[PDB]
C-alpha cells in the first residue's frame, strides 16, 4: 500500500499507488515553470532579443558567453525552453498498469511517459478531458515548433556551473532530467491508448480493483477519482470548485466513508476574491479602452477565458463600448470554441436545464452573431486585413515564452498607453516580465483562480473526514510569501502527511478483510449452530475456484471446544449400557476407569486425555460420544 511521489509542484502532481496488485499512477503534470528560465521564441526576430549582452562568469574558464545571456540584471539561458518531467527512473514505469487523468492541466506530460518508458497499459479519462487535452497538446507543439531552435546550451547543467550561476537560476531542480518537447507521432499515439470514461462510471480493473470519477467543477471535464475494493476506498481529489462555476458541481457523496483524501491541486494564491477580481478585470480593461488602446491577455485556449468572455460580453451592454472588437488568436481557436459549444451535458444542472431549451449554453455564440468575437487561426492571413486599433486581444501561451503572445508583447510594449492583463495562475507574474524589462507596458496582476482555498478545504475535510490525509509541504508549511500568518493552511486534526518530490510513503492502513463469493449448494449445505447469544457459528468446508481475481467457493478442519463434565459423562455411559465404571479424584482432575476395553481417562482444566485398548467400534463410539458433548469451531 505504497504512494510514490514523482512531482514536486503542488498542482501538477504525479502519484503512483501500489494497491492490491495495481500500480495506478494518478495524473501526469508537465511542469512548465522551467520554461520561464529561457529566452522567448519570437516568430520574427527582434533587434532587442537578438542584441543582448551575454553574461560572463568572473572566472572566465567556461564558454558560457554564448550559453546564457543577461537582460536588465536578470539572466536567461538561450535555447529551446526545456520541460521539467517527473522521475521516470524511480520505479520502472513499464510496470505502471493504469494511468488516471484528473483534468487536461495534468495531461501535458503524457507523451513522454507513454512513449519513452515501455508503458503497455491503458490510460483512462473523460472525453471532454481528452478533447481539450488534444487541443492543448496541439497548441503547445505548434507554438514550440513554428520557428525551430536547436538545444545548443548544455554546460549550465553541471553542478559547479549551476551553483556558480546567479539567482533565479540556482532555483532549478534536476536540470539534467529536463527534456525537449515532443512530436506529432506521440501526440497521435498518446491519444490512441486513452479510453473514454464517464462521470462516476463504475469501472473495474483487472478483476481486482474499482476506479470511478466524480464531478469536480474546476474545468469542463475535470474529474476526481476513487480507487476502491469492497472494504476500502482511497480517493484522490485534484482540483475542485464548490464556488459557483459553469461545469457540473462537485460531488460530496462518494468522498465520504473513505480513508485517504489526497489534497492535490489547491489554489495557487489563497488571498483572492474571484468575483471582485474579475470585477477588477472589467474595470482596468474598460479604463484602458476608454483611454483608447488595446489590451493584451495571455490565456489558455480553454478554461477560465470562457468565463471571462461571458462577463466581458455582459460588460459591453453596461459600458456602451461595442466599437472595440474582440479577437481570439490561437491555432486551435475554432475547434476550441466548437468544443466549448458542444460539451454541454457536463455543465451545471441549471445549465443542463438551459440545454433543455434549444439555446447555446456558452454565450460566446451570442458574441459571434453580434459580430463581436472574431477568432483566427493565426496572424498569417485574415488577421492582417481585419485588425482594428484599439482592440482586446487574447493570445497564446501565458508563460510568455512561446506563441503569438511574444509578438504582441513586443511591438506594443513601447508605450504606457497600453496594458497587458495577466489572468491565469501557476505562472509567476514578475518572472514573466523578466526578459521584457526594461519596459513601459502597463501591467496589472489580476489572476482569476477557481480552485478551492483553505477555508473550504477545512469544510471539505470536516465534512467527509478520512482516516489519513496526504498533501505536499506547501500545504503544511506556511507559504513563502505570507509566511507571517498561520491561518490559511491545512486545518485538520489527524496528523497530516507531507511528501516532497520523489518520495516513498507507506500508507499506514493494512489490508486484512477481503471478499469471497459462494455458489448456492454450499450455502444450503451449512447449518447454524448458535452457542452464545447473538453469536452464531457454522462449519464450512469447500474448495476455492480461482479466476480473474474474484475468488469463488465450490464443493469438492473444524475443532473441538468446551470442557466435558465427568459426572454427566459417567451418567450417560451408565445409561448407554456401559457398566462398572469407577471414578477417583485428584488435585485438579478426575481419573475414570472402564474395565471394558481397558479404558482410563483423565480430565483436567482445559484438558482431556483418553487411553484405550485395541478397539475400533468402541473407540469410534467414544469419539462420537465425546465430540457431541461440546461445541465445534
Amino acid at each position: 500500500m505504497k504512494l510514490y511521489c514523482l512531482s514536486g509542484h503542488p498542482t501538477l502532481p504525479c502519484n503512483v499507488l501500489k494497491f492490491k496488485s495495481t500500480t495506478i499512477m494518478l495524473d501526469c503534470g508537465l511542469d512548465m515553470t522551467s520554461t520561464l528560465n529561457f529566452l522567448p521564441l519570437p516568430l520574427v526576430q527582434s533587434p532587442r532579443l537578438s542584441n543582448l549582452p551575454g553574461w560572463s562568469l568572473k572566472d572566465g574558464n567556461a564558454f558560457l558567453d554564448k550559453e546564457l545571456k543577461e537582460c536588465s540584471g536578470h539572466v536567461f539561458v538561450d535555447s529551446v525552453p526545456e520541460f521539467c518531467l517527473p522521475e521516470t527512473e524511480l520505479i520502472d514505469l513499464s510496470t505502471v498498469d493504469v494511468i488516471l487523468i484528473s483534468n487536461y492541466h495534468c495531461m501535458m506530460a503524457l507523451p513522454y511517459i507513454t512513449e519513452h518508458t515501455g508503458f503497455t497499459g491503458t490510460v483512462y479519462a473523460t472525453e471532454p478531458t481528452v478533447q481539450i487535452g488534444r487541443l492543448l497538446m496541439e497548441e503547445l507543439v505548434n507554438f514550440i515548433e513554428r520557428v525551430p531552435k536547436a538545444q545548443s546550451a548544455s554546460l549550465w547543467k553541471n553542478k559547479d556551473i549551476q551553483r556558480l550561476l546567479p539567482s533565479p537560476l540556482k532555483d532549478a531542480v534536476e536540470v539534467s532530467t529536463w527534456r525537449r518537447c515532443y512530436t506529432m507521432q506521440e501526440v497521435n499515439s498518446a491519444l490512441s491508448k486513452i479510453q473514454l470514461v464517464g462521470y462516476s462510471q463504475k469501472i473495474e480493473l483487472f478483476g481486482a480493483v474499482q476506479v470511478t470519477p466524480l464531478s469536480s467543477g474546476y474545468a469542463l471535464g475535470s474529474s476526481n477519482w476513487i480507487i476502491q475494493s469492497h472494504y476500502e476506498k482511497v480517493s484522490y481529489v485534484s482540483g475542485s470548485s464548490l464556488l459557483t462555476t459553469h461545469p457540473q458541481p462537485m460531488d460530496q457523496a462518494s468522498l465520504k466513508n473513505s480513508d485517504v483524501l489526497v489534497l492535490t491541486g489547491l489554489t495557487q494564491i489563497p488571498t483572492a476574491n474571484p468575483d471582485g477580481m474579475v470585477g477588477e478585470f472589467c474595470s482596468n480593461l474598460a479604463l484602458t479602452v476608454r483611454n483608447g488602446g488595446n489590451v493584451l491577455v495571455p490565456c489558455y485556449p480553454s478554461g477560465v477565458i470562457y468565463d471571462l468572455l461571458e462577463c466581458l460580453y455582459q460588460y459591453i451592454d453596461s459600458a456602451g463600448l461595442s466599437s472595440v472588437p474582440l479577437y481570439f488568436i490561437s491555432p486551435v481557436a475554432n475547434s476550441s470554441l466548437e468544443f466549448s459549444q458542444i460539451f454541454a451535458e457536463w455543465l451545471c444542472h441549471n445549465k443542463q436545464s438551459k440545454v433543455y431549451l434549444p439555446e447555446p449554453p456558452f454565450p460566446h455564440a451570442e458574441l459571434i452573431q453580434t459580430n463581436k468575437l472574431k477568432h483566427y487561426p493565426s496572424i498569417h492571413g485574415d488577421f492582417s486585413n481585419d485588425f482594428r486599433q484599439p482592440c482586446v486581444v487574447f493570445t497564446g501561451h501565458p508563460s510568455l515564452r512561446f506563441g503569438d503572445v511574444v509578438h504582441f508583447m513586443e511591438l506594443w510594449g513601447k508605450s504606457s498607453l497600453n496594458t497587458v492583463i495577466f489572468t491565469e495562475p501557476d505562472f509567476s507574474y514578475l518572472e514573466a516580465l523578466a526578459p521584457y524589462q526594461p519596459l513601459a507596458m502597463k501591467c496589472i496582476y489580476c489572476p482569476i483562480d477557481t480552485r478551492l482555498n483553505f477555508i473550504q478545504v477545512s469544510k471539505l475535510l470536516k465534512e467527509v473526514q478520512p482516516l489519513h490525509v496526504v498533501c505536499p509541504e506547501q500545504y503544511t508549511q506556511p507559504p513563502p510569501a505570507q509566511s507571517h500568518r498561520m491561518d490559511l493552511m491545512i486545518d485538520c486534526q489527524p496528523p497530516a502527511m507531507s511528501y516532497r518530490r520523489a518520495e516513498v510513503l507507506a500508507l499506514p492502513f493494512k489490508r486484512r478483510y477481503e471478499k469471497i463469493e459462494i455458489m448456492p449448494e454450499l450455502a444450503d449445505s451449512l447449518v447454524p449452530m448458535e452457542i452464545k447469544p447473538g453469536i452464531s457459528l457454522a462449519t464450512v468446508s469447500a474448495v476455492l475456484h480461482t479466476k480473474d481475481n474474484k475468488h469463488l467457493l465450490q464443493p469438492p478442519k473444524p475443532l473441538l471446544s468446551g470442557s466435558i463434565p465427568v459426572e454427566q459423562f459417567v451418567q450417560t455411559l451408565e445409561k448407554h449400557g456401559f457398566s462398572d465404571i469407577k471414578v477417583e479424584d485428584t488435585a485438579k482432575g478426575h481419573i475414570v476407569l472402564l474395565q471394558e476395553a481397558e479404558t482410563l481417562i483423565q480430565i483436567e482444566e482445559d484438558s482431556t486425555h483418553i487411553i484405550c485398548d485395541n478397539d475400533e467400534m468402541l473407540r469410534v463410539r467414544l469419539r462420537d460420544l465425546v465430540l457431541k458433548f461440546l461445541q465445534k469451531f
Binding site: 520502472d92 553542478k159 516513498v504
Partner: protein
C-alpha cells in the same frame, strides 16, 4: 574514485528515505560510469544490499541493472545477482529489482550458453512467486533465455493461470520464443483456440497473433488455416477496436488461404463489417489486407474492386490517400465498367495536393475497356486543368502513360475530341494553350502502335507534332510520320 566517494557519502549520511533515494537518483541522473570500476561499484552495491527499507534496495538494484546495460561487467555481476536472488528474496519490490537485474544481465552482451542463459533461466523457473511477485516477469525471463534448439510445457500450463497480466506476459514470452525459431509444436494451436474467449481485453489482441503464427507454421490439423482464418474473421466482429486492428493486421500477415473460403468472407461476413466501424486504424489495416490478398489471389479482384469504390466518402485525407494506394497496387488486369464515375469525380476538391497527385498516379496505371469512360475521364481532367492551372506536368505524365497503356480505346475519340470538320478548314489552335498540349500528348502516345491514325490528322497537327517532338521529347514519342522522318 567518484563511485567510492559517492558510496562513502551515502554511508556517512545514512538517512533512510532521504539520503539513499536522493543519492541514487543523483547517481543515475548525473552521468554513466563507463568503466570497469562500476563493476567494483557493484561490490559497493553489495555493501548496501544488506539493509532495511527495501525501496532503497530496489532503486539500488535498478541502478545495478542500468550499470549492467553499459556492458561494463560480465559474469561476476551475474553471479552476484544470482546470489542476491537466492538470498535476498524479500517481497515483490526486491523480486522486481532482482528480476530486472537478471533480465538486464541476460541481454547485456553475451547471450550465450554455459551458465549465462541456462543457469539463470533455471533459477528464474525455480523461483516462481505465489502471487504476481515475479510471475509475469519471470515468464519473460524464461522467454529471453532460450535453452536449446530441441521447455515449452511450463509456458503451456501457464495459459490458464490466474492473472490476465501473467497471461499477457506468457503470450509475449511465446512471441519471443517464436522470434528465435525453436520449432513450435501443434498443441499450441489447441491451447490458443481455447484462448479466444478469455472474456477480457488485451489477451485477444494477442491471441489473434498466436492464431496467426501457429496457423502459418504449417496447415495440417484435420485443413488448418481455413478454421484459423474463420476464427480471425469472427474476431473482426469484436466490439473493442484494438482487437479489430490486431485481427485485421495479423490476418494481413497471412499469405496462404483456400480460395473458396476467401470468397466466403463477403457473402453467405468479415470485410462487410470490417471497414465501416472505426478511425483510420481498422480501415487501413483491412485494406492493406485486401491489397495482399488481391496480390496473392489472381481471382477475387472484382470483389475488392467494388468494395473499394464505395468507401470514397470517409472524410479522412489519410484514408483517401491510402485508398488510392490500395487500388493502385491491385490495378493489374482489372477494368472499370461502371465504377469509374466516382473515382474520377473524387478529384473534385479544394486543394487536395497529395490526394490529387496520388489520383494522377492512379489514373496512369489503371485499365479500362470502354470508350465513354475515356471521354468522361478526359473531360473531367480538362475541367481539373481549367480549375487548377498548377499541375500541367503531372497531368502530362499521366496522360502520356494512359495513352501508352492502351491505345485502342481512343481511336473513335479523335474524330470527336478535336475540330476535324469535313469541309470547313480547321483553324490552327493556340499552341501556348497548355490544355490542347495534353490531348495532343495523349493522341501521339496512343499513335505509336495503331497504324490507322496518321491518316486522321491535319497539316497543322503534323506541324504541332514537329514542335512537340522537338520541344517536349520526354512527353511525345517518335513516330513514323512522313513529315518528321
Amino acid at each position: 574514485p567518484s563511485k567510492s566517494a559517492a558510496l562513502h557519502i551515502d554511508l556517512c549520511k545514512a538517512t533512510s528515505p532521504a539520503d539513499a533515494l536522493q543519492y541514487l537518483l543523483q547517481f543515475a541522473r548525473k552521468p554513466v560510469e563507463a568503466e570497469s570500476v562500476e563493476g567494483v561499484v557493484r561490490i559497493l552495491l553489495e555493501h548496501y544490499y544488506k539493509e532495511n527499507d527495501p525501496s532503497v534496495r530496489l532503486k539500488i538494484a535498478s541502478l545495478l541493472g542500468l550499470l549492467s546495460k553499459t556492458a561494463g561487467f560480465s559474469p561476476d555481476c551475474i553471479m552476484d545477482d544470482a546470489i542476491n536472488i537466492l538470498q535476498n528474496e524479500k517481497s515483490h519490490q526486491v523480486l522486481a529489482q532482482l528480476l530486472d537485474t537478471l533480465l538486464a544481465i541476460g541481454t547485456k552482451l553475451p547471450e550465450n550458453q554455459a551458465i549465462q542463459m541456462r543457469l539463470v533461466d533455471v533459477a528464474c523457473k525455480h523461483l516462481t512467486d505465489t502471487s504476481h511477485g515475479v510471475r509475469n516477469k519471470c515468464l519473460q525471463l524464461l522467454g529471453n533465455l532460450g535453452s536449446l534448439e530441441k521447455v515449452q510445457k511450463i509456458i503451456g500450463d501457464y495459459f490458464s493461470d490466474q492473472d490476465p497480466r501473467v497471461r499477457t506476459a506468457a503470450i509475449k514470452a511465446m512471441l519471443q520464443l517464436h522470434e528465435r525459431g525453436l520449432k513450435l509444436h501443434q498443441t499450441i494451436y489447441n491451447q490458443a483456440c481455447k484462448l479466444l474467449s478469455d472474456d477480457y481485453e488485451q489477451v485477444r489482441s494477442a491471441a489473434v497473433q498466436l492464431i496467426w503464427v501457429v496457423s502459418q507454421l504449417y496447415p495440417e490439423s484435420i485443413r488448418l488455416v481455413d478454421d484459423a482464418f474463420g476464427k480471425i474473421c469472427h474476431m473482426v466482429s469484436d466490439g473493442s477496436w484494438v482487437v479489430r486492428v490486431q485481427a485485421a493486421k495479423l490476418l494481413g500477415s497471412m499469405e496462404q488461404v483456400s480460395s473458396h473460403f476467401l470468397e466466403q468472407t463477403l457473402d453467405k461476413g468479415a470485410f462487410v463489417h470490417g471497414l465501416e466501424d472505426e478511425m483510420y486504424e481498422v480501415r487501413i489495416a483491412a485494406v492493406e489486407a485486401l491489397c495482399m490478398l488481391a496480390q496473392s489471389s489472381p481471382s477475387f479482384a472484382e470483389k475488392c474492386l467494388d468494395f473499394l469504390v464505395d468507401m470514397f466518402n470517409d472524410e479522412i485525407e489519410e484514408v483517401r490517400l491510402q485508398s488510392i494506394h490500395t487500388m493502385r497496387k491491385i490495378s493489374n488486369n482489372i477494368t472499370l465498367r461502371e465504377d469509374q464515375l466516382d473515382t474520377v469525380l473524387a478529384v473534385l476538391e479544394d486543394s487536395s495536393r497529395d490526394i490529387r497527385e496520388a489520383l494522377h498516379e492512379l489514373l496512369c496505371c489503371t485499365n479500362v475497356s470502354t470508350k465513354e469512360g475515356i471521354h468522361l475521364a478526359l473531360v473531367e481532367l480538362l475541367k481539373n486543368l481549367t480549375k487548377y492551372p498548377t499541375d500541367r506536368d503531372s497531368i502530362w505524365k499521366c496522360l502520356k502513360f494512359l495513352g501508352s497503356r492502351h491505345p485502342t480505346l481512343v481511336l473513335p475519340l479523335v474524330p470527336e475530341l478535336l475540330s476535324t470538320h469535313p469541309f470547313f478548314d480547321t483553324a490552327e489552335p493556340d499552341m501556348d494553350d497548355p490544355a490542347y498540349i495534353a490531348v495532343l500528348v495523349l493522341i501521339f502516345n496512343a499513335a505509336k502502335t495503331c497504324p490507322t491514325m496518321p491518316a486522321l490528322f491535319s497539316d497543322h497537327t503534323f506541324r504541332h507534332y514537329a514542335y512537340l517532338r522537338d520541344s517536349l521529347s520526354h512527353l511525345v514519342p517518335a513516330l513514323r510520320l512522313p513529315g518528321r522522318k
